[PDB]
Nucleic acid binder design. Structure first.
Ligand SMILES: Nc1ncnc2c1ncn2[C@@H]1O[C@H](COP(=O)(O)OP(=O)(O)O)[C@@H](O)[C@H]1O
Ligand SMILES: Nc1ncnc2c1ncn2[C@@H]1O[C@H](COP(=O)(O)OP(=O)(O)O)[C@@H](O)[C@H]1O
Ligand code: BEF
Ligand code: BEF
Ligand SMILES: [Mg+2]
Ligand SMILES: [Mg+2]
Lengths: 381, 53, 379
RNA sequence: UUUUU
RNA sequence: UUUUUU
């Protein structure tokens, strides 16, 4: 056959990819995987939702030699749900490598469960969030001196945060100096390339520096001008006329997330909410039912703005304007995964809202038409 | 779903009686806007439409 | 045919104004004799113009004198007295020197004395209780009346309390006068009671009661228990097209509850019954006849006399107590021979016995309600 | 807005 | 019961 055969991956890895239904690699996979399995450090930037996860999952599994009772791979990201998503993704590609063990560690759940996992059934791959991982390392429950692969996803966001940056630096110090380091994101500010660069020796550099190509040309993106009072009524009408399977609606605070979710419910919209402050077991149950297509409407903070891969999200809503063009590009990317078509609607409330939307329009050479009153169902799905 | 179909019956009567007895046009649209929403989705037990239940 | 009656031209002008083209049977039979001042005991078919008979006959004979009341008309309910008074105004359109007035309870008697002392009418319509009170305190002078009319006379004299009041009012009036009584039902036992008020009167009886039924009415029934009555009525009110309906119940408390429940199903229903303040009763009655509301829930207060044109359906939510009540009640719809619908709820075996009593007595068929009916067949 | 407590 | 000055 053709396609993924070019890499000469392990047969049990290739049998996993077949069961995933994938037919051909994306450009980032073709470019980055063959170098990644050699042990090279990589700094990878590529179009949103184009298969960055499978790059470091397949490459680590390819290079992995399982050692019983010893953690060889560490993968970290900025949100607990993303770490959960990455762990299950590791499980689906290690489907035919029964000896490989994967675990996920994050806060909001008892540390003793994480400790019991480590001391009773030690994994070869650990994914998790910087806080809990660092806590387990200081605990000495998590032995990080056998680490051969150090992976950061959404690395620019993880390193734009100095409190999180120092935590990942403190975690980085307790790992062997000779090991692979790979960092992934769709956004790489020219400011933060050196910050990631300090973590690697002679990395391969995948850059999209000229951001003409960062846009998802399979998405139709519009906007509407309206007051804050008109935001809710316009949202209600749009949710009534537009046909969709699933929708993500982004607000700028926890207060707005809870209030809009409650207001949608009282209008008989089966809306769920996810945000920090929920019990972690509850927001895991709410993340799963959205992923398993048991709820149609999700209201979220920027907690859901990056990396989330939901199969049936057709529309993305900017009920509040994103803080920057970085956050905008990741939120709109929650629809149209792997280049399928979708829809993105942005609310322009005040001066600063139009200020940012003209920035993102200019930065990407994109057209954002004012929203027409009738849209083809063929257009966005 | 037994709740779903029978919620549609209460609305299909309120809408019917509103037309039959000269209701305000805002009420006709509000009921129809709720009917088509209930078909597109379920019945949320915490919704204010659950007043009739 | 109204030309032959030899009425006053203004009176004849009022007849054409309200659109009458041909007199009814009761109008042909009774009007010429009633013009002459003869006592009349009249029984006639429901809704076939008995009111016009004694309104026109008294207006024809009336020789107004500014200080005195000449015609007294009484009936059993306040709203019927109100209806009759507006019927006098309707036929007094071209007789400007004629004054009419209505007196009934539930309104201040001082206002009734005010109209008597300051602008005394020639014709008074009222209910026996208020009329008796005005006559005892001497505000109402009954010594000049020359015409004494009772409408729904059988019901008015079957009530012993009301018969006693009417008798006392009668004894305050001159012996030389015309007395006329009208109703759609005149029992064998009550005819002599009416006759004792009269002297050699013309008698119009319907002894073949099979011709008291309105063959322009479709009359059906449904067998139901009291639990099932509420929503069978709800679906019937949804399915059947109508301009106006009247829904009859057996008590004031049931009238309040059923009306309140209907509004909460967003049927714009109104209720009339005793215990409503009379201003609310009249204003409620007026808007129903003004076509402001479509659904009326009532006790027997509305069970006879009431004349609302667009009542197409009459509902017996509770079984009428006897066959007379059924006859008058069902006749609130299909006025003057027009097409209407009648539906009766049969609750227990006694209700079925009452229904069977009705269809035997009138030789009328009350079939079970079919699942779907034609709009033209009752409109 | 997110990241052990 | 319903209705009839209070
Ligand atoms: N070669 C491929 N063919 C088809 N689908 C793929 C391929 N690689 C990845 N995908 C799918 O694309 C979706 C988005 O991938 P993800 O790794 O979340 O994107 P990114 O991390 O680049 O934002 C996932 O559901 C994944 O299964
Ligand atoms: N000759 C006629 N032609 C048409 N309508 C009439 C005629 N006489 C009376 N009516 C109407 O019939 C309706 C009911 O009459 P009504 O006197 O209340 O009947 P009854 O008193 O005999 O039950 C009234 O609206 C009246 O205007
Ligand atoms: F850039 Be992908 F959506 F993680
Ligand atoms: F007898 Be009629 F209906 F006054
Ligand atoms: Mg990702
Ligand atoms: Mg009459």
């Amino acid at each position: 056959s053709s396609g993924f055969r070019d890499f000469l991956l392990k047969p049990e890895l290739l049998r996993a990819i077949v069961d995933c239904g994938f037919e051909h690699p994306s450009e980032v996979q073709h470019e980055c995987i063959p170098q990644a399995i050699l042990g090279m450090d990589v700094l990878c930037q590529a179009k949103s939702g184009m298969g960055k996860t499978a790059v470091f999952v397949l490459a680590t599994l390819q290079q992995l030699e399982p050692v019983t009772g010893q953690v060889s791979v560490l993968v970290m990201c900025h949100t607990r749900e993303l770490a959960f998503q990455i762990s299950k993704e590791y499980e689906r590609f290690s489907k035919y490598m029964p000896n490989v063990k994967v675990a996920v560690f994050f806060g909001g759940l008892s540390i003793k469960k994480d400790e019991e996992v480590l001391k009773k059934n030690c994994p070869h791959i650990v994914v998790g969030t910087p806080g809990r991982i660092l806590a387990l390392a200081r605990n000495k429950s998590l032995n990080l001196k056998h680490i051969k692969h150090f992976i950061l996803d959404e690395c620019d966001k993880m390193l734009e945060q100095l409190d999180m940056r120092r935590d990942v630096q403190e975690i980085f110090r307790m790992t062997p100096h000779e090991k692979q380091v790979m960092m992934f994101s769709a956004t790489l500010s020219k400011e933060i390339r050196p910050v990631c660069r300090k973590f690697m020796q002679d990395p391969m550099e995948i850059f999209v520096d000229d951001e003409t190509k960062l846009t998802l040309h399979g998405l139709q993106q519009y906007y509407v001008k309206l007051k804050d009072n008109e935001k809710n009524r316009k949202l209600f009408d749009l949710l009534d006329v537009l046909e969709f399977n699933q929708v993500v609606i982004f607000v700028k605070s926890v207060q707005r997330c809870i209030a809009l979710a409650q207001l949608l419910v009282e209008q008989n919209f089966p809306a769920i909410a996810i945000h920090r402050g929920m019990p972690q077991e509850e927001r895991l149950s709410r993340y799963q039912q959205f992923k398993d297509f048991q709820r149609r409407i999700l209201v979220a903070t920027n907690l859901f703005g990056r990396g989330m891969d939901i199969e049936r999200v057709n529309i993305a809503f900017n009920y509040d304007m994103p803080e920057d063009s970085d956050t905008y590009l990741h939120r709109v990317a929650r629809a149209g995964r792997f280049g399928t078509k979708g829809l993105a609607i942005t609310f322009v409330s005040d001066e600063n809202d139009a200020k940012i939307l003209n920035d993102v329009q200019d930065r990407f050479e994109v057209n954002i038409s004012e929203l027409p009153d009738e849209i083809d169902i063929s257009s966005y799905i | 779903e037994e709740i779903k179909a029978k919620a549609l019956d209460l609305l299909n009567k309120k809408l019917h009686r509103a037309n039959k007895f000269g209701q305000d046009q805002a009420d006709i649209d509000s009921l129809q806007r709720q009917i088509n929403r209930v078909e597109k989705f379920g019945v949320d037990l915490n919704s204010k439409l659950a007043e009739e239940l």
